[PDB]
Amino acid sequence: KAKTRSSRAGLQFPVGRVHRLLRKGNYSERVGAGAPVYLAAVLEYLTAEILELAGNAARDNKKTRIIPRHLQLAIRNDEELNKLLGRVTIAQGGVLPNIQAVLLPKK
Amino acid sequence: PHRYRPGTVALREIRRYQKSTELLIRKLPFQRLVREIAQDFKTDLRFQSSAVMALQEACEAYLVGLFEDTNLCAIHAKRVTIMPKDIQLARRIRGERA
Amino acid sequence: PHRYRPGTVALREIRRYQKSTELLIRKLPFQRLVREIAQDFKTDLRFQSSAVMALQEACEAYLVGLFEDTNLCAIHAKRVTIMPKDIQLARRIRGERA
Amino acid sequence: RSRKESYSVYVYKVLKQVHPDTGISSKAMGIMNSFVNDIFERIAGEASRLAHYNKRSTITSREIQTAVRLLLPGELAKHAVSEGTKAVTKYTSAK
């Protein structure tokens, strides 16, 4: 007889949990029916976007397992993810290969 | 006819403007600029006069701050003339840009 | 008898170390330096293993970014050698002091 | 011996839809946990502020939307809003 608010909304992300985390968080007295559906969608979406590009970066290193370094290459190579995560360190993510031109040897 | 040497009025102006707090952009041009930009986001928009003045106060404080940082950049390069490369280096190190 | 020229090994290290993600400080020196600094705020302190590593991750990330902005301030003054004054200018514009 | 919740189960399900022959390290899964919790806090926070500014007791779909608009850059915001109205469409059309 029971059906998860997620399976209803079309989401792998827990509408139920999100709703509870919104209550136990002191964001507001009350929480509209859709807000947790919306919020869950947005988190899923943004997960897909990163896991997509992380996938693509893992594939270029001849790798099937996504590691921190793959997440970092996907995020800093994307103008919008890289801004959203402008003040975020990915542990074990290292940096993008970048040698200023004038530091290159002459011949 | 008696000229001040290059720099002497620039330093006179640094002393004068650093002493005062009046906005340095003309009110009306700045108000037009605000209206254009807002219009381009949403038509039929109106502004409390205080909103425009809050924007003007924020814009001038920003631009003055950026010129301090910019000037530090020229001097770091052993110049005393600010150039666009100075503003850009400043905004990169402020993390306002990649 | 064959010797690499100044700054050729440098580039190599650059390419090497920009490819890797391993922490680049030895764990124990750092563990000692944490407990020291921390002693001064509360004595008899214990540190989860993940606490210390969270700190080293953050600290090394910070310094590597500072070296990037430092390097841009060196390159801006038409050098290739980072100097205190580059570290100092990067911290000043970032808002870490002065 | 008490329950330590995460988003891993849900990160993994999205991974598979998007790259069905691709895995993901403990340490990477950590980073996706951090990520979700962070954007959760940013969006929930701006939504809270919005409701407070308009003297409202309730964070609805609308607050989440507006928060998403303020917090996500350009394209990310547009796609996030579509994915977000879609899921709320599907859920209002479920008996």
Partner: peptide
């Protein structure tokens, strides 16, 4: 997968490349 992903993704323009 079944997500409305971004069609094109641009790189950020770094100062100094």
């Amino acid at each position: 997968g079944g997500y409305n992903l971004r069609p094109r993704t641009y790189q950020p323009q770094r100062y100094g490349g």
